[PDB]
Amino acid sequence: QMQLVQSGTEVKKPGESLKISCKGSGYGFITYWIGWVRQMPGKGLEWMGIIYPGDSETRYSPSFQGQVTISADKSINTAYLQWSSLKASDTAIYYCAGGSGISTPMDVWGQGTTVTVSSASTKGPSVFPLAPSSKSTSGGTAALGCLVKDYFPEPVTVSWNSGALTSGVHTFPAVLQSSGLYSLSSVVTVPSSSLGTQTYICNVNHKPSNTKVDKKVEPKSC
Amino acid sequence: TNLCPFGEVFNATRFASVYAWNRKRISNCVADYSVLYNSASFSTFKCYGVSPTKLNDLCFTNVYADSFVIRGDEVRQIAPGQTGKIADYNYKLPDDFTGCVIAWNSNNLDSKVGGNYNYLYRLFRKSNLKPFERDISTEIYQAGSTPCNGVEGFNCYFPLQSYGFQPTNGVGYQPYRVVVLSFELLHAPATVCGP
Amino acid sequence: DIQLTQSPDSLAVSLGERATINCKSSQSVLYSSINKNYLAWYQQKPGQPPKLLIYWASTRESGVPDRFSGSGSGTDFTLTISSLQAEDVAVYYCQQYYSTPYTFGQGTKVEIKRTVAAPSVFIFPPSDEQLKSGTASVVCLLNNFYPREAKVQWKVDNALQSGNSQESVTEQDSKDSTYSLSSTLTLSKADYEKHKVYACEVTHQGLSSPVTKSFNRGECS
Ligand SMILES: *[C@@H]1O[C@H](CO)[C@@H](O)[C@H](O)[C@H]1NC(C)=O
């Protein structure tokens, strides 16, 4: 049994070229045909094309003919998918799948290559405290959290109390604001009695911008 | 319950010509097919109908192993829907092909120093071959309007050509040994499975 | 070339119950030689790559648990999960490999069905830190509800807001099979300081009447 491994995450501007790769490790590779699948954010799977490494037989889908270029390199067991001029609408995740024949199901899949095309530039996030309400059910539970706003690109990692607090935590999917920057919110529900006895801190890490921020969330003085 | 004779076909001492391609009918055997994936000796390994990796868990009625020798430029033509001298006149494959195509270079074997002309191929024929057809007709091809009464000459050509297999030819003009596996299954008893 | 259409788009079944997904083809996919239809069923979980479950429309990949089964012929195919488990919440696709170009189905989202659960509604005002920047984000949280359908309506001094709110929803919590929604209302600091009452009105099946959570600008809330 063999496996596939694709290149790393890509973040490009509109108009730049790009060429992502997909290398297969293991014995029995001579038989595998390698295809490319595109998955747009929240959308379904789209079959782009297929190639054979041994003789570089390349078959495109009608939707991607002349839009992309599929190539291969049998000396290193690596298939390639490239764009000449990237468009903002090309932002998606591209999997490479492998079938041991041409009319054969895709048995082996890669991990996926996330490609983001946007005119936005790299910017670190701003973390704002979603402070818990003072007027809350004192016998029940209260809610607080952090607002990770105006960052680019994806992703950001959000933990609570340096990983100590995990139960009852909901880190929401980011939204793409009209300004081209992302916005995300993480919340946690805790017993209201613990609002004055336990210190709550959210940890935000944005590796693309190399920005780490710890924000202490506490009930407003008022 | 016996071992499969697949080793005879691939490791055969001599290989047949294109037009007179050999065909080994295999039955009552058990083959693992793993020796075919793992061997890096094959320069081309194109299965079409079935995933070869998940084959030793299946069973078929009859598996046919065709074998011959072609030129490097011709290796692409052993495939469904292909068009060319080899695909139309020597060996044609059906569009619904359920099998596999294996090819490996053999310039070190099928090449005399001055040229091994013993490998032939049909370059002349007035109708394209039907799938899995085998033609040995030596009848003189009639290219012109005047009939050829068994005598060749102008517009009267011998229908077979010789491969000039010198070891100094480019990779395009070098002898490649080709095996073609075909798997068929009717509602008859299947007699060739794997482990 | 060949077209594939799935049904339904979304499907919710309780734990241990049966899940049925249909896939109809615009062309017969049956390799005449061996009598095996070239239809495949894939499973894709959030963040995961797709995973092959069934090939030839009835034969199952190794390791696939005994609860997945494929059936059908001609242009009608079915995927059936006998005892639906929590780890099976995913999107399922059907794909043909008769002839290039390959084509996938539209996809079926499969979630767990549970009892109706009302949401815990909270509302957060913008921090003074954010007000120093120039904008203001008012956040409304709908925690641990089911089903996923929910309507959030923003009100600024009892005036309905539309076109300035973005919301996102978490994946189904594997523990309680509930969703959580976060809606953000964005407006300039100038527009923010002009009004007093900011409210979030939630309409959900588990709520007999709409639930409103509000606050007054400046007051301790
Ligand atoms: C053919 O001979 C080689 C060399 O010994 C051996 O490795 C292989 O198993 C034999 N059979 C086949 C089918 O290649």
Burial class of residue C153 in the structure, from the number of CB atoms within 10 Å of its CB (0-12 exposed, 13-18 middle, 19+ buried): middle
Ligand 1, residues B3, B9, B10, B45: which to mutate, most atoms within 8 A of Cβ?
Answer: B10
What chain A residue is nearest to C129 in terms of C-alpha separation?
A128
Which 73-112 residues of chain C touch chain A by CB within 8 A?
91, 93, 95, 97-107
Beta-carbon contacts of residue B1 (< 8 Å; ≥ 6 apart) = B30
B57's tokens? 């868990």
CA angle, residues C207, C210, C213, in degrees to nearest 5: 110
Beta bridge partners of B76: none
Gyration radius of chain B's alpha carbons: 18
Q: Report d(CA A177, CA C189) in Å as an integer.
A: 17
Report helix, strand and coil shares of chain B as percent, to nearest 5: 10, 30, 60
Ligand 1, residues B6, B9, B26, B35: which to mutate, most atoms within 8 A of Cβ?
Answer: B35
DSSP notation for A99-118 = ESSTTS---EE---EEEEE-
DSSP C8: -
CATH of span A126-217: 2.60.40.10
Query: Under an 8 A CB cutoff, do B185 and C35 touch?
Result: yes
Peptide bond just before A191 cis, omega within 30 deg? no
Residue C191: its H or E element: helix C189-193
C16's tokens? 């241990």
Give domain limits for chain C. 4-112, 120-216
Q: Report d(CA A86, CA A18) in Å as an integer.
A: 7
* From A47, A109, A173, residue closest to C101, measured CB to CB: A47
Determine the number of helices (DSSP H) and then strands (DSSP E) in chain C. 2, 19
From residue B96, alpha-carbon distances to A182, A193, B111, B129 in Å are 50, 72, 35, 16
Q: Report d(CA B68, CA B152) in Å as an integer.
A: 28
Instruction: Enter the resolution in angstroms.
Output: 3.1
Query: Under an 8 A CB cutoff, do B185 and C31 touch?
Result: no
Ligand 1 centroid distance, CA of B104 (Å): 13
Same domain, B21 and B62: yes
Centre a 10 Å sphere on the Cβ of residue B57 and count the other Cβ atoms it contains: 11
Positive or negative torsion for Cα B93, B95, B97, B101: positive
Tell me if domain C4-112 and domain C120-216 are identical in fold.
yes
**φ and ψ at B72, to 5 degrees?**
-55, -40
Question: How many residues make up chain C in this entry?
Answer: 221
Q: Which residue's CA is the nearest one to ligand 1's atom 5?
A: B11
B104 lies within 8 A of chain A by CB: no
C-beta B45 within 6 A of ligand 1: no
CATH of span C120-216: 2.60.40.10
Q: Report d(CA A17, CA A156) in Å as an integer.
A: 26
From residue A174, alpha-carbon distances to A94, A168, A170, A204, C221 in Å are 20, 19, 12, 13, 27
In this structure, the dihedral spanned by the alpha carbons of residues B105, B108, B109 and B113, taken in order and rounded to 10 degrees, is: 130
Q: Report d(CA A188, CA A159) in Å as an integer.
A: 11
Provide, as residue numbers in chain B, all residues whose Cβ is less than 8 Å from the Cβ of A98.
none
Same domain, B95 and B162: no
- What separation, in Å, do the N-terminal and C-terminal C-alpha atoms of chain C show? 60
Q: Report d(CA B10, CA B2) in Å as an integer.
A: 19
Same domain, B19 and B107: yes
Q: Report d(CA C58, CA C72) in Å as an integer.
A: 8
Question: How many residues make up chain A in this entry?
Answer: 222
Centre a 10 Å sphere on the Cβ of residue A200 and count the other Cβ atoms it contains: 21
Same domain, B147 and B65: no
Question: How many residues make up chain B in this entry?
Answer: 195
Same domain, B103 and B159: no
Tokens 């973040």 label which residue? A11
Same domain, B61 and B124: no
Positive or negative torsion for Cα B102, B104, B109, B115: positive
Give domain limits for chain A. 3-117, 126-217
* From B51, B60, B96, residue closest to C32, measured CB to CB: B96
In total, how many domains does chain B have? Answer: 2
From residue C53, alpha-carbon distances to A124, B42, B105, C150, C158 in Å are 41, 31, 38, 33, 52
C42: nearest Cα among C18, C75, C64, C17: C64
Q: Which domain holds residue B134?
A: 115-166
User: For C4-112, which CATH superfamily applies?
Assistant: Immunoglobulins (2.60.40.10)
C179: nearest Cα among C162, C201, C202, C200: C202
Q: Report d(CA C10, CA B5) in Å as an integer.
A: 52
C-beta B60 within 6 A of ligand 1: no
CATH class of A3-117: mainly beta
Q: Report d(CA C88, CA C48) in Å as an integer.
A: 13
A109: nearest Cα among A54, A39, A12: A39
A97: nearest Cα among A185, A195, A222, A6: A6
Same domain, B37 and B103: yes
Determine the number of helices (DSSP H) and then strands (DSSP E) in chain B. 3, 13
Provide, as residue numbers in chain A, all residues whose Cβ is less than 8 Å from the Cβ of B105.
none
Same domain, B176 and B145: no
From residue C71, alpha-carbon distances to C37, C39, C61, C74 in Å are 10, 10, 15, 11
Same domain, B138 and B104: no
The experimental technique used to determine this model is X-ray
Tell me if domain A3-117 and domain A126-217 are identical in fold.
yes
